[PDB]
Amino acid sequence: ITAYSQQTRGLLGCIITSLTGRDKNQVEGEVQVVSTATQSFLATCVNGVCWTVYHGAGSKTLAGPKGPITQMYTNVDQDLVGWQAPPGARSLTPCTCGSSDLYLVTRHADVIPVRRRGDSRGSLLSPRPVSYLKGSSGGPLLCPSGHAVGIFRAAVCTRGVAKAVDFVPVESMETTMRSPVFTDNSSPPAVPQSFQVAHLHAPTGSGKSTKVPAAYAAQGYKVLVLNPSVAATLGFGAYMSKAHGIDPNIRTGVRTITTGAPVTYSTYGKFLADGGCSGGAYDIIICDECHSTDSTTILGIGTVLDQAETAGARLVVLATATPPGSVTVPHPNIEEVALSNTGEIPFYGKAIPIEAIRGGRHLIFCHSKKKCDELAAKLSGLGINAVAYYRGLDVSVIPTIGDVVVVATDALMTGYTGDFDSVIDCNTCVTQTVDFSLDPTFTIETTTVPQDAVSRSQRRGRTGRGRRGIYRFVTPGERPSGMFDSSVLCECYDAGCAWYELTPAETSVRLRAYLNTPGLPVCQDHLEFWESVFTGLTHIDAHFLSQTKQAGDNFPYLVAYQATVCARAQAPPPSWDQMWKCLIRLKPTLHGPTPLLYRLGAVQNEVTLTHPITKYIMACMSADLEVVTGSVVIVGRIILSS
Amino acid sequence: ITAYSQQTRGLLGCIITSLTGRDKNQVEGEVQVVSTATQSFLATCVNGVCWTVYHGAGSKTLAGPKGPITQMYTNVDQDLVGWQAPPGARSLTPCTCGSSDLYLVTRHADVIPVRRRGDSRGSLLSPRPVSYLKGSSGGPLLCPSGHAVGIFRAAVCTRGVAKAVDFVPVESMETTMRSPVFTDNSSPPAVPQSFQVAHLHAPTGSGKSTKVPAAYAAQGYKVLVLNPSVAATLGFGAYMSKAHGIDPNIRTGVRTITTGAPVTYSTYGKFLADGGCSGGAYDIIICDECHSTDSTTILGIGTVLDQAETAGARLVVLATATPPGSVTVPHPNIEEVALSNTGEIPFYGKAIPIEAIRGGRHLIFCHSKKKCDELAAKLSGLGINAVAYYRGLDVSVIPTIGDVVVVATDALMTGYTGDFDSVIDCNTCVTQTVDFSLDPTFTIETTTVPQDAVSRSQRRGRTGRGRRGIYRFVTPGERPSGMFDSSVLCECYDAGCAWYELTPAETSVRLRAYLNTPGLPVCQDHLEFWESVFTGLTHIDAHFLSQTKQAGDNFPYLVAYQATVCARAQAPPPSWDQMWKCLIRLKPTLHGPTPLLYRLGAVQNEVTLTHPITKYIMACMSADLEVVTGSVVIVGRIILSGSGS
């Protein structure tokens, strides 16, 4: 086997073709070079199906001869998507009597020898920089006779150097082919004789956590409904009294009510604080909004999946309206209008006409609190009754009745339950991302990114609830849904340690149950890595943890812990911004460089790497770390010949 | 002073406008958000001129109402370009009363306060990560009255955090509108009465290396001609004694001839090996190919400029056909044919048709050693006479002579002087960049990037010399000419230590003369930093140095030094790549983690950071480090407030 590449499109063609969805050029080759606006990667045809990775393609259509081809297969768990190959497209054929000598074809048309080590793994005969494999996701692993064994999806790394590859095996594709593309998940399942995890995909208004738990209780079962929102959990208790004549148990941090009833509503956080499942307590457990990828929900759901069976439950329902891989569809009640540039109010490069928001109750989503304060002011500058809401502020600042423009972050989503006449959406969110930067250890960085379909649908769903609404937007873009960053795993161990008195080992068991359960949001498996680093964080200063807990910023454990190390070396923190405010009083005694454990923000002080905890975390970085490497458009091909 | 942004084009419109060069949207506001295909940055209108940074725009045209607007001003040394603003567009105007409280407008419409600290520097009241400043190049620094003080060009960094900003002062924009828009430099300068540096920009064949120095020696001056290429240098000497009747002195490694004549032809390397200017010797030094950004040339030219006046010369001539900022333009003898996907031979995503290269003598430029060998091994399969040439092979592997298709890297253009029927250009090359990555120290990475105007020009220029030629290519366009990376500064210090017995302080004096001389290729001024690193690299093993020098690969001092530190700790090298072959002998005795000094490639072994030299280099990374932050197209704007703050 040998290979070379042929480019068939340039920038301009690729953008035009991506907008229209019409690709006229004939699909030749078996390995295609594909591209979205943000990324380029590979697609491989097998058994008449053009396959690639979910983390590159998302749920996007493939531009084709008669216009956009919508995906025939999507499996977020296998990181696999497929489109029916356009008429007259070659296919590699599956490899059955497989060799251990495989060849990986990259986007540079290189043919890299790989030695197979298991269903999904292969060692590179000669290790290479991970940068060299990027853009080759979705290309084939070939057995010696040129038949397909799988498609490449991730490199396995030691300190930035790829030594092994992870792939989606051909058999998994055949399983996905023989799976039903359409499955009915809209009705509540019947309670089985032995334990089952089941999925409920249904709009908000189906009664996922009002009607369906009502109905279960009527058949004699005890039901626990978990929700990420306090305001929503509290609110179910009133509604269920009015609407179904059940006064349920309510468990939040701010407020608990035990009536002895057969239905309990809890936060995930309060469920965690109470130590998880009581044996005997519940028959069914409904995990509502299980699309939610915040650390408390993930840890919470992970706890239910580890413990439920053994505490006597027979049914776990994983419930959401926006499951992984779902796409934003029209809402009959909601008119959608792109923002233009003619308007009095500037808003993320577009404009809001004052007429759109003068009078009425309206919600404008902003990515940051700084922008909420900004817009809430510029709107009082024009005589609108505006109010900012974000983490920290009390929800009471939002008037329950009367005109208002609420300028809010996603904190709104758990603080406040009401709806609005309209929603205006900046279409972006602030996210955290881990870089394995080895300078000295890892970095957690905050970025602004394009929203995904879950965020778009949750934001838009603040209007149109049983009455007509308007959704105005800055951009129609929408990144793939149902994935989250390894930094969310870090947060889970952080919270396990800071709040729920979980050991890292204990936290691993729960997260492992989450990862290994299909049909939930997905993430790189880095449990060992993160467990290993929290295990060495011993003897934290109780007093520092206390302040970082109460200040309520992110990574209270890792921050407090760095504080601890700095304070025991009478040394300053990475910097004097608010992150390290738990240390302001000790300032005048603190001198020299910072013994840096990791980077959670800008580091303005000089640093030393000689602290034994820094050396422990640096040793932790030698772990195997699996990293990944408008219509989708074919921009070239890789022609295959030994 | 407050600001907000307006987006006026998306991706599709932006590509269409960059190709047509026609933009009808009217130009509102003072501060435009502009884009190329690869980057995005700012551009600020002052006094009817729309200004931005050379490192962003290159010599590119701006899309305007009637079509592409050519640049009116191009000053590579100030990193400043300017297009005549369309009629009716708003401009800012200079600050009148000299405030020191400044405001930087970023591409995000943030306004950050800056304290003026010099003609072109100002410190950030709140130090910020450089990432937040990227793409704000070309933005204004405003005084409190909203008037223009300069444009932002770079951030001064300690360990990744911006603490100061560098800007092009509004004076330098007056200094620029107060001069002619066209200059000559097409003629050899007359010899002045006292020392002067002059530029000569003339086509190849002008006889810039043959005809002009003969003239100067006719007037009875001693002249030295420095060239990067040993082949070109022997070729000028051999050409002189024939078509000119002077047997010039020749100085090269392979061949040195002292005839006593008043013309001398040398490479920059032999000149450096000779200890530069031997006082009293020459009146005129011609520095040919002063566009070359190889380390030997930069160091030679720098030596000439530091030493020539004090050694009694009256004229230094900086000579090239492709000066910084120069655009490629059609050559009347050469027809340029875009390759397509149709052809028997796959070539960088495109294809070359056989008919196009079967008869005659042709040159195919490929980016690497391995692509040449593959493309030769293939072409000789199809049955053509194909030889590969690249660094480490003999110039004579080429025939003189028969039919031939030579498949070469850029090494060709120092090793070999002949030309061809057609040239096929992949239009990419290999470059080294440094990354201040703190993992633990710095990284020198090799990447394959798009060629620049100089490279296209010299590659094309191997066809159609006074006859006819065909130039075939994979891609149009160029990145800007006349800029080189900080890694090249590192190479000069390395070469100074390894080959030319220069201490780092001495190397700094030569490179400083080069940076400070205008009209030469430019680079970020990282002299103090690199000097510090090399000053700490003491007691190198002479045997390892001698092997890395002879093997001919890059950074032989940095490699030998890492090898030295490893051998002395009985530790393994970072990997067992070819780069570390001077340690192969010792492999069985070497154990444990490598004391890593810096990253020159993949590091596969475990690493320890406790070695004293590692810490010393880590400490050097606290130095102030200045980093930079189709038609150009306007894709948005930043509206500044009219009253109050």
Ligand SMILES: Nc1cccc2cn[nH]c12
């Ligand atoms: N589709 C996916 C994206 C990112 C990570 C993972 C892990 N399994 N599937 C994944």
